[PDB]
Design a protein around this motif. Structure first.
Motif, PDB file in Angstrom:
ATOM      1  N   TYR A  95      -0.781   5.191  -0.270  1.00  0.00           N
ATOM      2  CA  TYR A  95      -0.177   6.509  -0.410  1.00  0.00           C
ATOM      3  C   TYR A  95       0.840   6.763   0.688  1.00  0.00           C
ATOM      4  O   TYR A  95       0.515   6.724   1.874  1.00  0.00           O
ATOM      5  CB  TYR A  95      -1.254   7.602  -0.400  1.00  0.00           C
ATOM      6  N   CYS A  96       2.080   7.018   0.277  1.00  0.00           N
ATOM      7  CA  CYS A  96       3.167   7.281   1.209  1.00  0.00           C
ATOM      8  C   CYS A  96       3.830   8.604   0.856  1.00  0.00           C
ATOM      9  O   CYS A  96       3.484   9.231  -0.146  1.00  0.00           O
ATOM     10  CB  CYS A  96       4.214   6.168   1.131  1.00  0.00           C
ATOM     11  N   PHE A  97       4.785   9.024   1.678  1.00  0.00           N
ATOM     12  CA  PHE A  97       5.508  10.265   1.434  1.00  0.00           C
ATOM     13  C   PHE A  97       6.853  10.232   2.159  1.00  0.00           C
ATOM     14  O   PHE A  97       6.942   9.792   3.306  1.00  0.00           O
ATOM     15  CB  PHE A  97       4.661  11.473   1.876  1.00  0.00           C
ATOM     16  N   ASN A 147      11.007  17.570   0.540  1.00  0.00           N
ATOM     17  CA  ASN A 147       9.759  17.040  -0.004  1.00  0.00           C
ATOM     18  C   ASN A 147       8.677  18.115  -0.053  1.00  0.00           C
ATOM     19  O   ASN A 147       8.508  18.882   0.898  1.00  0.00           O
ATOM     20  CB  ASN A 147       9.270  15.865   0.842  1.00  0.00           C
ATOM     21  N   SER A 186       1.021   8.355   4.144  1.00  0.00           N
ATOM     22  CA  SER A 186       0.527   9.707   3.930  1.00  0.00           C
ATOM     23  C   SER A 186      -0.748   9.926   4.740  1.00  0.00           C
ATOM     24  O   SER A 186      -1.270   8.988   5.343  1.00  0.00           O
ATOM     25  CB  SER A 186       0.252   9.939   2.446  1.00  0.00           C
ATOM     26  N   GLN A 187      -1.246  11.158   4.753  1.00  0.00           N
ATOM     27  CA  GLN A 187      -2.453  11.478   5.504  1.00  0.00           C
ATOM     28  C   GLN A 187      -3.740  11.106   4.769  1.00  0.00           C
ATOM     29  O   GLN A 187      -3.856  11.290   3.557  1.00  0.00           O
ATOM     30  CB  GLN A 187      -2.472  12.965   5.869  1.00  0.00           C
ATOM     31  N   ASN A 238       5.529  17.171  -1.747  1.00  0.00           N
ATOM     32  CA  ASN A 238       4.309  16.441  -2.077  1.00  0.00           C
ATOM     33  C   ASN A 238       3.914  15.484  -0.958  1.00  0.00           C
ATOM     34  O   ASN A 238       4.711  14.652  -0.530  1.00  0.00           O
ATOM     35  CB  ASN A 238       4.502  15.650  -3.375  1.00  0.00           C
ATOM     36  N   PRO A 239       2.673  15.600  -0.463  1.00  0.00           N
ATOM     37  CA  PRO A 239       2.188  14.730   0.611  1.00  0.00           C
ATOM     38  C   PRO A 239       1.737  13.365   0.098  1.00  0.00           C
ATOM     39  O   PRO A 239       1.898  12.354   0.783  1.00  0.00           O
ATOM     40  CB  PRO A 239       1.041  15.537   1.205  1.00  0.00           C
ATOM     41  N   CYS A 240       1.172  13.341  -1.109  1.00  0.00           N
ATOM     42  CA  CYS A 240       0.691  12.098  -1.708  1.00  0.00           C
ATOM     43  C   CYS A 240       1.637  11.572  -2.786  1.00  0.00           C
ATOM     44  O   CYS A 240       1.782  12.177  -3.850  1.00  0.00           O
ATOM     45  CB  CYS A 240      -0.697  12.293  -2.330  1.00  0.00           C
ATOM     46  N   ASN A 241       2.265  10.434  -2.510  1.00  0.00           N
ATOM     47  CA  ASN A 241       3.188   9.810  -3.450  1.00  0.00           C
ATOM     48  C   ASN A 241       2.735   8.374  -3.714  1.00  0.00           C
ATOM     49  O   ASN A 241       2.149   7.732  -2.840  1.00  0.00           O
ATOM     50  CB  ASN A 241       4.605   9.829  -2.880  1.00  0.00           C
ATOM     51  N   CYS A 281      -5.140  11.845   1.184  1.00  0.00           N
ATOM     52  CA  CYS A 281      -4.537  11.272  -0.016  1.00  0.00           C
ATOM     53  C   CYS A 281      -5.286  10.076  -0.586  1.00  0.00           C
ATOM     54  O   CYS A 281      -5.624  10.056  -1.770  1.00  0.00           O
ATOM     55  CB  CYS A 281      -3.093  10.856   0.265  1.00  0.00           C
ATOM     56  N   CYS A 327       5.044   1.103   3.419  1.00  0.00           N
ATOM     57  CA  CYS A 327       5.684   2.275   2.835  1.00  0.00           C
ATOM     58  C   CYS A 327       7.196   2.094   2.831  1.00  0.00           C
ATOM     59  O   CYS A 327       7.857   2.329   1.820  1.00  0.00           O
ATOM     60  CB  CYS A 327       5.322   3.538   3.621  1.00  0.00           C
TER      61      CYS A 327
END
Ligand SMILES: *[C@@H]1O[C@H](CO)[C@@H](O[C@@H]2O[C@H](CO)[C@@H](O)[C@H](O)[C@H]2NC(C)=O)[C@H](O)[C@H]1NC(C)=O
Ligand SMILES: *[C@@H]1O[C@H](CO)[C@@H](O[C@@H]2O[C@H](CO)[C@@H](O)[C@H](O)[C@H]2NC(C)=O)[C@H](O)[C@H]1NC(C)=O
Ligand SMILES: CNC(=O)[C@H](Cc1c[nH]c2ccccc12)NC(=O)[C@@H](CC(=O)NO)CC(C)C
Ligand SMILES: CNC(=O)[C@H](Cc1c[nH]c2ccccc12)NC(=O)[C@@H](CC(=O)NO)CC(C)C
Ligand SMILES: [Ca+2]
Ligand SMILES: [Ca+2]
Ligand SMILES: [Ca+2]
Ligand SMILES: [Ca+2]
Ligand SMILES: [Co+3]
Ligand SMILES: [Zn+2]
Ligand SMILES: [Zn+2]
Lengths: 426, 426
Positions: B376-378, B384, B338-339, B386-389, B342, B327
């Motif tokens: 998937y990162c954030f 911020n 991310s969690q 958005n959790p899923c980027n 995602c 990430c």
């Protein structure tokens, strides 16, 4: 002193090299298809060449310029030799056919094989088929390209390559066989000599005619010793300027002054009308007079028909065409005019023996017009066993023919293949 | 002021520069539409560059040559600045997609506006958008064109123009602002330092990879400090060669010599088997040993599976790939994985969320191989929402996905878009 009055008079005569530069297709591309850029590039190169040749009492004047932007007019190739040849030929049949110039140089963006950066026919100056040279736009520094061009032009003017001994200073001279950014804008003492001797022996006529201020197509440069459009006089820079009549700072005449240089200008004032400016050089030359309202002084000659050279000919536009001297010019020293009987071969109207070529045919000379057709010479040598010998040329059948105005009899000269009286304006 | 292990390790590494040269249409015409001539030109230039950069522990190798003999791929204008940009973008778009190289140089016969004879992005080496430079074949002497190219490449290598306080002898250095036809082939003391600093604070990886002898598109040259096909060794020119193991004349090992280069080569001999030729850099690295019958030192590692990063990942080919660092690599510092929820988008099998490609289609992930598809990162930015980027490259879709061997589940890693066990040879 050992030089004929003409030779010395020739050397003292200011020299002018009406140059015609040509940039090839690659040059156009090389400078972003920008004719202004290419053109400017050439102008600069000239601004470097001009001051160089001034030290040779020669003024290079750009009387023409052509950029082959639509496409080349000769097969410019990596072979500097071939390129030169093709360029010269083109210059002899194409260019010289539409623009009169003393010398033409080709500035190409192509890369000649080997280290050579240019070629120029030796002594070819003024010559219709050899007064040319080519130069490669080898360096970004235009000062170096100019030198390369001066080098080629140097050859055209009889100069050779500098030999180990030759010197012009602490740096290489224009005629140095090899370039370098340490090259100067000076000619070695050798070049100086080679040139002089060349001139003395050949005396190329064309470099005597000064171009009209309008014939020059290069942007006027105040201080280049040449009066160009927009200028009233040019005595060089304020520091070198020796003419009090001119303001080297703006190239304008100084208040009161009407002229600066010229044979009809004294103390910044037009010589009185009627005053002689140039004496008569020969028995066919007429002393020139000043119009009083002009700075220049046109040259005039005696009226045609005036007996010259111990009654061996009749003046013709300043010259005294003798059938004897013509033989010496066609075959060399010792040459003499063949006896009358020889010219009878002109009555045959054959391939060589004729007087006039009305259209393309050959009209045999009339019994009394023989000495006006083909010139029959006889080299006064204990070897030649032929009294009649002509000088023919497949290219020009006129070459070898008795020049017009040549005394063909008593009080008569050849006009148009006919021996007419010299008492009629011709 | 100190040097980290990775830095010193990098500095010591032998540097290579896989250069790709490009000649424009004018070059083609400039050399009489003679590809051999154009290639020879480029070859001669590289022959001067190589020795220059070797003194910098940099081995320049021509791994590609493209001559636009038909038409230019970009609009080469007299504007260096615009040409550099057009070429730099063309390379990043058309060139790199066809052949891999560390740096490209455009050799054009066009004349750049002003004194500029070349241009090259500062410290852009290895950069797909900035590891480029443009050089003008301004001089006829390829020696000056080489220094010009070496100069641009110099910038690409983090080097800048020399100050009046910088020296490399009596002659000006490569990174001299002004190009003198008397310029030397050396780098100023300043140049050498800026370079070192550049490499230390950047460490461009591409120049660490050596080019396969079969990748060098240039004709073998005994003396180019690069062992090409048909050569056993190359200590440079016979005049400069100092290597006591190589016959600089024939590029052959001398009598009693088994090698001349290599961590496992000492005094022309193979180091005894068992001898260590490289320590372990990380925890996934294994100390390397010489075979005794070879000059090279193969860099072996720990078996894939070895726990690393405080048990956050499992060794994979000498590296410890973990989403945590991934990430950060994709979205810079602060960026964290991310969690779980995602990664579920990978089951989607859509445009971005998937696990692997068949050809043009994408095999969506499965409930378990979920954490092996798109990463998937954030950002940790308070703003911020958005959790899923996701990181996505329309150019290359593989970019952004999870790295192979990356610890997905507990004792398992990503093999082929699947979270296979680490115990099984993956
Ligand atoms: C063609 O070349 C000329 C110069 O060789 C360009 O004009 C120059 O433009 C600069 C400004 O960028 C001026 O400082 C120079 O004085 C100009 N030169 C002169 C005296 O003409 C011209 O722009 C080029 N043509 C184009 C538009 O590409
Ligand atoms: C095409 O260019 C090559 C140059 O790369 C020319 O080959 C040279 O030929 C000369 C002889 O005239 C030799 O002295 C050089 O050594 C050659 N160069 C090399 C190394 O190839 C070739 O002649 C050119 N072809 C044409 C049509 O001119
Ligand atoms: C940029 N290139 C050069 O300087 C070469 C160098 C050179 C030619 N022959 C050699 C043999 C051995 C070593 C070097 C050379 N010379 C030339 O271009 C000169 C060629 C010439 O005398 N043309 O009439 C014209 C020049 C003076 C403008
Ligand atoms: C052949 N012409 C040159 O030597 C000119 C000289 C020059 C640049 N800027 C100037 C400002 C005022 C006067 C002269 C100059 N410089 C160049 O071509 C250099 C341009 C450069 O820095 N490229 O990255 C690259 C070169 C070192 C190969
Ligand atoms: Ca003037
Ligand atoms: Ca007169
Ligand atoms: Ca080699
Ligand atoms: Ca290892
Ligand atoms: Co080495
Ligand atoms: Zn010469
Ligand atoms: Zn620079």
């Amino acid at each position: 002193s050992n030089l004929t009055p003409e030779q010395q008079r020739y050397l003292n005569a200011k020299k002018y090299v009406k140059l015609f530069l040509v940039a090839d297709y690659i040059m156009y591309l090389k400078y972003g298809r920008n004719l202004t850029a290419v053109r400017t590039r050439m102008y600069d190169i000239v601004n470097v060449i001009t001051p160089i040749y001034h030290r040779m009492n020669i003024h290079v004047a750009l009387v023409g310029l052509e950029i082959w932007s639509n496409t080349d007019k000769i097969i410019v190739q990596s072979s500097a030799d071939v390129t030169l040849d093709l360029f010269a030929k083109w210059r002899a049949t194409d260019l010289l056919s539409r623009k009169s110039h003393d010398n033409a140089q080709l500035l190409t963006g192509i890369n000649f094989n080997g280290p050579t950066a240019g070629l120029g026919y030796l002594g070819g100056i003024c010559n219709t088929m050899y007064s040319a040279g080519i130069v490669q736009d080898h360096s970004k520094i235009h000062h170096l390209v100019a030198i390369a061009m001066a080098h080629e032009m140097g050859h055209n003017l009889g100069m050779d390559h500098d030999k180990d001994t030759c010197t012009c200073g602490t740096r290489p001279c224009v005629m140095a066989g090899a370039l370098s950014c340490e090259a100067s804008f000076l000619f070695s003492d050798c070049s100086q000599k080679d040139h002089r001797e060349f001139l003395i022996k050949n005396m190329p006529q064309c470099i005597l005619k000064k171009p009209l201020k309008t014939d020059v197509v290069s942007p006027a440069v105040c201080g280049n010793y040449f009066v160009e459009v927009g200028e009233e006089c040019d005595c060089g820079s304020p520091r070198t300027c020796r003419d009090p009549c001119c303001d080297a700072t703006t190239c304008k005449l100084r208040q009161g002054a009407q002229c600066a240089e010229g044979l009809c200008c004294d103390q910044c004032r037009f010589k009185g009308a009627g005053t002689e400016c140039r004496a008569a050089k020969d028995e066919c030359d007429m002393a020139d007079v000043c119009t009083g309202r002009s700075a220049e002084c046109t040259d005039r000659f005696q009226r045609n028909g005036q007996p010259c050279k111990n009654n061996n000919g009749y003046c013709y536009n300043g010259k005294c065409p003798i059938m004897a001297d013509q033989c010496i010019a066609l075959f060399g020293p010792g040459a003499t005019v063949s006896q009358d009987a020889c010219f009878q071969f002109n009555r045959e109207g054959n391939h060589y023996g004729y007087c006039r070529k009305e259209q393309n045919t050959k009209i045999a000379c009339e019994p009394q017009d023989v000495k006006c057709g083909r010139l029959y010479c006889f080299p006064n040598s204990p070897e030649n066993k032929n009294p009649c010998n002509i000088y023919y040329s497949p290219n020009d059948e006129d070459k070898g023919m008795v020049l017009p105005g040549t005394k063909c009899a008593d009080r008569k000269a050849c006009s148009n293949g006919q021996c007419v009286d010299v008492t009629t304006p011709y």
